[PDB]
Amino acid sequence: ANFNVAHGLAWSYYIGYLRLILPGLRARIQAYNQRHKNVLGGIGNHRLHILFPLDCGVPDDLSVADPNIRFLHELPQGRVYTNSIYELLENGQPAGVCVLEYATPLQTLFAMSQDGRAGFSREDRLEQAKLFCRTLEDILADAPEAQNNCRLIVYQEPTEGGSFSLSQEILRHLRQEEREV
Amino acid sequence: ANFNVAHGLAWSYYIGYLRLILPGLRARIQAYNQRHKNVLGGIGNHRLHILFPLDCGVPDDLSVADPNIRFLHELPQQSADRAGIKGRVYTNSIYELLENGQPAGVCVLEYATPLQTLFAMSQDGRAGFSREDRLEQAKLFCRTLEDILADAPEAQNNCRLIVYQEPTEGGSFSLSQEILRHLRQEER
Ligand SMILES: Nc1nc(=O)c2ncn([C@@H]3O[C@@H]4COP(=O)(O)O[C@H]5[C@@H](O)[C@H](n6cnc7c(N)ncnc76)O[C@@H]5COP(=O)(O)O[C@@H]3[C@@H]4O)c2[nH]1
């Protein structure tokens, strides 16, 4: 079989999702900030943060296993598209809040490498993950309204487990984006 | 610039949708029937019927596509935590197929999403992806997905692929008639 899938994953993810949700994301975050102004506190960073584990290990547990990343609130809105606001903690204390999620199509790359078909090893998976990343960034580089409204967080380590701190990785990105504004 | 997307679309649709939605479909249909069979009626056909128009953009709505296709009811939603989204929602719908002014069939029915992706790609204004390219990628997407499913016995027993051309110059074609022919061949 032909396992050159990265280009299809990138265009699927852009055309079928980022192109659809990124234009209205800032307004949904501002709507949330206004609804909950006197109560819940506000989200200053209006970008979508997309976690991109190159090992394609994408959890579905809302990061319950990582106590420094905690689901805070749904970002609300036929097909339904919703997003998630997460709290980041550092030294046990709150440290950040942002709209955050994983690049779901990495789970397709994971299943292909696990599904025990031949001709698609873990190294083949990593090469497809990188090409998926590069193609997506090339697509986003020519859609400046999309590039304005999302940031990819790419990393090599297991997303959960071991000494790598995903919360610190996300926090570092938030502070970088803070410098840009 | 590299618009060879069909292979990725097929694997993504299989892993990220069919493998996720098909195992729970029968229970959702059973729940629908227990709630509705005594008034609205029940659904005897428990398979997901997926439409693959090869040579025409995916209509945004089935009743628009064919006046002989009428929305009946949604199934209970499938909700699941997914890649950081809490309770991501997957919805599926039952349609009735009309013939000569009477309902003639009822089934869970939808379009294959990647064909909509391909259509949007050809309409986005970028150079190098014409209707000709779209048609070639649509056939390859269908072929690849069928190749994958021929290795997936459980899935292929729980969905049915309805693949068809459409005429563009007034040759007779009824989408409901095409679906009905498939439904009546499944009862064998
Ligand atoms: N009929 C149908 N109903 C659905 O709910 C659905 N969800 C996905 N799909 C299609 O199955 C395949 C796999 O989806 P995956 O989630 O792995 O990639 C998805 C996913 O990464 C992202 N995405 C789409 N919708 C959502 C969503 N509600 N929440 C988060 N991410 C989403 O954008 C990618 C492409 O989405 P679609 O372009 O709508 O087509 C998909 C795709 O062809 C669906 N098809």
From Swiss-Prot, chain A:
PTM note: Phosphorylation by TBK1 leads to activation and production of IFN-beta. The phosphorylated pLxIS motif constitutes an IRF3-binding motif, leading to recruitment of the transcription factor IRF3 to induce type-I interferons and other cytokines. Phosphorylated on tyrosine residues upon MHC-II aggregation. Dephosphorylation by PPP6C leads to inactivation and decreased production of IFN-beta. Ubiquitinated.
Residues of the full protein shown: 152 to 340 of 378
Region (Cyclic dinucleotide-binding domain (CBD)): 3-180
Main location: endoplasmic reticulum
Entry's Gene Ontology molecular function annotations: 2',3'-cyclic GMP-AMP binding; cyclic-di-GMP binding; protein homodimerization activity; proton channel activity; signaling adaptor activity
Topology Cytoplasmic: residue spans: 2-181
Keyword set, alphabetical order: Autophagy, Cell membrane, Cytoplasm, Cytoplasmic vesicle, Endoplasmic reticulum, Golgi apparatus, Host-virus interaction, Immunity, Innate immunity, Ion channel, Ion transport, Isopeptide bond, Lipoprotein, Membrane, Mitochondrion, Mitochondrion outer membrane, Nucleotide-binding, Palmitate, Phosphoprotein, Transmembrane, Transmembrane helix, Transport, Ubl conjugation
Tissue: Expressed at higher level in the spleen, lymph node, lung and bone marrow, followed by the small intestine, heart, liver and brain, and to a lesser extent in the stomach and kidney.
Subunit text: Homotetramer; in presence of cyclic nucleotide (c-di-GMP or cGAMP), forms tetramers and higher-order oligomers through side-by-side packing. Interacts (when phosphorylated) with IRF3; following activation and phosphorylation on the pLxIS motif by TBK1, recruits IRF3. Interacts with DDX58/RIG-I, MAVS and SSR2. Interacts with RNF5 and TRIM56. Interacts with TBK1; when homodimer, leading to subsequent production of IFN-beta.
Annotated family: Belongs to the STING family.
Residues that bind 2',3'-cGAMP: S12, Y17, R79, T104
Compartment(s) where it occurs, according to its Swiss-Prot or TrEMBL record: Endoplasmic reticulum membrane; Cytoplasm, Perinuclear region; Endoplasmic reticulum-Golgi intermediate compartment membrane; Golgi apparatus membrane
Protein name per UniProt: Stimulator of interferon genes protein
Any one of the GO CC terms: Golgi membrane
Any Gene Ontology biological process: cGAS/STING signaling pathway
Residues that, per the record, bind 3',3'-c-di-GMP: S12, Y17, R79, V80, Y81, T82, T104
Entry remark concerning the domains of this protein: In absence of cGAMP, the transmembrane and cytoplasmic regions interact to form an integrated, domain-swapped dimeric assembly. In absence of cyclic nucleotide (c-di-GMP or cGAMP), the protein is autoinhibited by an intramolecular interaction between the cyclic dinucleotide-binding domain (CBD) and the C-terminal tail (CTT). Following cGAMP-binding, the cyclic dinucleotide-binding domain (CBD) is closed, leading to a 180 degrees rotation of the CBD domain relative to the transmembrane domain. The pLxIS motif constitutes an IRF3-binding motif: following phosphorylation by TBK1, the phosphorylated pLxIS motif of STING1 recruits IRF3. IRF3 is then phosphorylated and activated by TBK1 to induce type-I interferons and other cytokines.
Binding site for 2',3'-cUAMP: Y17, R79, T104
